[PDB]
């Protein structure tokens, strides 16, 4: 069982004050904090074995190469891919989904073809598809949501047709906390002749991923959300689909032969990795995976289930607070106070040391569906505790009273 | 005047042995090493103020944002751009040139249009243009080289015509060491109605860049070659051209309004930065710039001029060694030993602690022009010394004798 004191002692950034109060960081769905094992991995790389990779002519070059391809294997095992050929390092989930939209969608869509998404998607899993359908004359459709912000498989079956070529959907929503029924959606897509593209940015850090159980055709994730460095992500795709897609970017490292006018590509996965790679970041993301595997993804999901059930109960104790989304959920709560703008809520909470986010959370169509212009969101990870949730609910109570008193005075 | 002892004391990786001999790192044209100021900048970011950027709702978020946009200003000043709107953070020179090829070239080329490159280009400044001309039915042309591997402006004037829309050329070649006459080539391109795209990956680390003196329309560079983190680069473009180009990637952060089917973009530079950015890396590249500015780019270029004139003299002392390229050059020497394969040269030198590279150096058309299948390359930076060049030339002498003796025995 995970001990939260020992886990928090590994994260130097948690041990500081903001505005004279201990920091209470509740914004890991925007980005997560890093343990010493990850930061010291980057230090050891730049202090001891930095060099360019995939020459293997000299000793430090060999070490850097082994570190970078070593991390590719750690990612393969971490999401249970069959092969390192299916693991592409990218700059982040957004670039991974764009590569699918450019190299897969723009090459396989025709007038009459549909791409199906959902109203709860993050912009990273919306805009690339808007652009690919515009480029190809294909059509974009939205699976509707149920009233608690879940998706019914009957709506999926209704929306997806035999003209659908791509269904793209979030594993977990970073606003509603909904965990979507990806494995059954993948069956529905494949029954209709479509591939499924899964936006895993908010699932991967928080629960075990098995791409062979999900049967997703593509899956995208970001290191910065899962205790790893910024600037790095992964695109997984089934090897038979990657083999037939052309590269999204062109350059050194992803070529085999270059003539004056024509070139041939390397095999996977290097066909999709043009230029000097994100060497230190990918090695640090391998360290993040080792760190999270040592704790156990199931343990971290059990902890977050506890925190989310505690938070939802304690929010129901507050009068005049609306929480969006379903009762069964990932480790976050997006909410509004009646009559206080969420930006003011986040400002007041930061004065008490508490970091949360306010805004649209890069889900404008979802805010429109929720009929609000903005919300506040507290999000949790393996270093948070029930005490910090008490601080949050106590501060929202004081926020409520403070604005009430301001109103009364005015 | 720069003191090399004090500079080398700042780079922890130099102080180690390989194969029982002090390391002699002569492969900075593949990637450079980092000073403590840069590594400690990344540590301080992840230890103290990591958070997502461009919310400014909570205190650490504000600090991370200020750090990231602060580094954008350091880059603007470092290359003398007029505006931060012209400074886009990317993953590296290769991605920066691809963005030009996708968003500029593919949008502005028609049958009959030409893109002009040179035989000495790196693949990053070849393959994207091969693909953009293929996509548009335009034509690719090559400026020829003079016999010493320089470019004559008369050949430029011959090759560039009023059908040319893009001239793309390296500032400095990572194989020949040639510094190309970019400012005069930009005049020739603009006289013909073309833009010029400059591959600055090998110039920026080593000499001062002034984009307003060069008058280049686009300029690309990589952090990992200039003492900064891996995984980050810059695309500079003249603001009036960026304003008319569409984004190359789509997602959160680069939008203003998102509807179900249509979206509008943010202003520059954020229009070109989709998804959570490379926050720590860009802050570390700002630290690299501060480090190099404190030493002085002109001082670092004077040091490398010394090292290159010393190396070329000492290589001319070796019998049976061919050096490629011109006498006036950047800080590198690419060479072959007669009758020893360059891979064997690099292997033997690594056994004496000396790191150099062998291969095509991502310039296959140039190797074909040189009539060789591969070369060896020693490349220098602000932490190298004449003593290390003596070690290199002494080891190449011993390599020569060793293979001679092997031949004799056989
Ligand atoms: C002249 C030149 N151009 C382009 C590149 C590609 O830069 P990156 O690998 O950082 O994308 C390099 C890297 N060696 C280079 O030296
Ligand atoms: C569900 C979801 N999808 C996609 C993204 C985009 O990931 P990145 O900003 O790392 O590219 C995020 C980031 N918050 C997300 O939470």
Curated annotation (Swiss-Prot), chains A, B:
Residues carrying N6-(pyridoxal phosphate)lysine: 225
Residue stretches in coiled coil: none
SUPFAM superfamilies named among the record's database cross-references: PLP-dependent transferases
Gene Ontology biological process: cysteine metabolic process
EC number(s) given by UniProt: 2.8.1.7
Co-factor(s): pyridoxal 5'-phosphate
Any Pfam family: Aminotran_5
Catalysed reaction equations from the record: (sulfur carrier)-H + L-cysteine = (sulfur carrier)-SH + L-alanine
Catalytic residues as annotated in Swiss-Prot or TrEMBL: 362
Activation/inhibition comment: A Cys to Ala mutation in SufU (Cys-41-Ala) has been described to be a competivie inhibitor of SufS activity and a non-competitive inhibitor.
Keywords: Pyridoxal phosphate, Transferase
One Gene Ontology term of the molecular function aspect: pyridoxal phosphate binding
Superkingdom to which the source organism belongs: Bacteria
Listed PANTHER family: CYSTEINE DESULFURASE, CYSTEINE DESULFURASE 1, CHLOROPLASTIC
NCBIfam families: sufS
Oligomeric form and interacting partners: Homodimer. Interacts with SufU; this interaction induces an opening of the active site pocket of SufS. Interacts with frataxin/Fra.
Record's function text: Type II cysteine desulfurase that acts as the initial step in the SUF-like Fe-S cluster assembly pathway. Catalyzes the removal of elemental sulfur atoms from L-cysteine by using the cofactor pyridoxal 5'-phosphate (PLP), resulting in the production of L-alanine and persulfide. Activity is stimulated by SufU, which acts as a sulfurtransferase that receives sulfur from SufS via a zinc-ligand swapping mechanism and transfers it to SufB.
The family this protein is said to belong to: Belongs to the class-V pyridoxal-phosphate-dependent aminotransferase family. Csd subfamily.
Entry protein name: Cysteine desulfurase SufS
Organism: Bacillus subtilis (strain 168)
Originating gene: sufS
């Amino acid at each position: 069982h995970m001990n939260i004191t020992d886990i928090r002692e590994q994260f130097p950034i948690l041990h500081q004050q903001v505005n004279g109060h201990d920091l209470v960081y509740l914004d890991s769905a925007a980005t997560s904090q890093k343990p010493r094992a990850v930061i010291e991995t980057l230090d050891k790389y730049y202090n001891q074995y930095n060099s360019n990779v995939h020459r293997g002519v000299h000793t430090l070059g060999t070490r850097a190469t082994d570190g970078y391809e070593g991390a590719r294997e750690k990612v393969r095992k971490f999401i249970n891919a069959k092969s390192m050929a299916e693991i592409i390092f990218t700059k982040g989930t957004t670039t991974s989904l764009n590569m699918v939209a450019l190299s897969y969608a723009r090459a396989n869509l025709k007038p009459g073809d549909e791409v199906v998404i959902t109203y709860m998607e993050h912009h990273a899993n919306i805009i690339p598809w808007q652009q690919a359908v515009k480029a190809t004359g294909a059509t974009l459709k939205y699976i509707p949501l149920q009233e608690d912000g879940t998706i019914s498989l009957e709506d999926v079956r209704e929306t997806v047709t035999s003209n659908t070529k791509i269904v793209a959907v979030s594993h977990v929503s970073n606003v509603l906390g909904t965990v979507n029924p990806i494995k059954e959606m993948a069956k529905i897509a494949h029954d209709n002749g479509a591939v499924i593209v899964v936006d895993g940015a908010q699932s991967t850090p928080h629960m075990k991923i098995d791409v062979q159980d999900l049967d997703c055709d593509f899956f995208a994730l970001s290191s910065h959300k899962m205790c790893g460095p910024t600037g790095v992500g992964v695109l997984y795709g089934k090897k038979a689909l990657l083999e037939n897609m052309e590269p999204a970017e062109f350059g050194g490292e992803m070529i085999d032969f270059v003539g004056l006018y024509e070139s041939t590509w390397k095999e996977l996965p290097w066909k999709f990795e043009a230029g000097t790679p994100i060497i230190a970041g990918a090695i640090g993301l391998g360290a993040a995976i080792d760190f999270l595997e040592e704790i156990g993804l199931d343990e971290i999901s059990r902890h977050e289930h506890k925190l989310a059930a505690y938070a939802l109960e304690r929010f129901r104790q507050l009068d005049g607070v609306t929480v969006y989304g379903p009762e069964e959920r990932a480790g976050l709560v997006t909410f509004n106070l009646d009559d206080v703008h969420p930006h003011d809520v986040a400002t007041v909470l930061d004065a008490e040391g508490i970091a949360v986010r306010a805004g649209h959370h890069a889900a404008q169509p979802l805010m429109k569906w929720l009929d609000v212009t903005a919300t506040a969101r507290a999000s949790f990870y393996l270093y948070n505790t029930e005490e910090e949730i008490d601080k949050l609910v106590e501060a929202l109570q004081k926020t409520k009273e403070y604005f009430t008193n301001v109103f009364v005075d005015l």
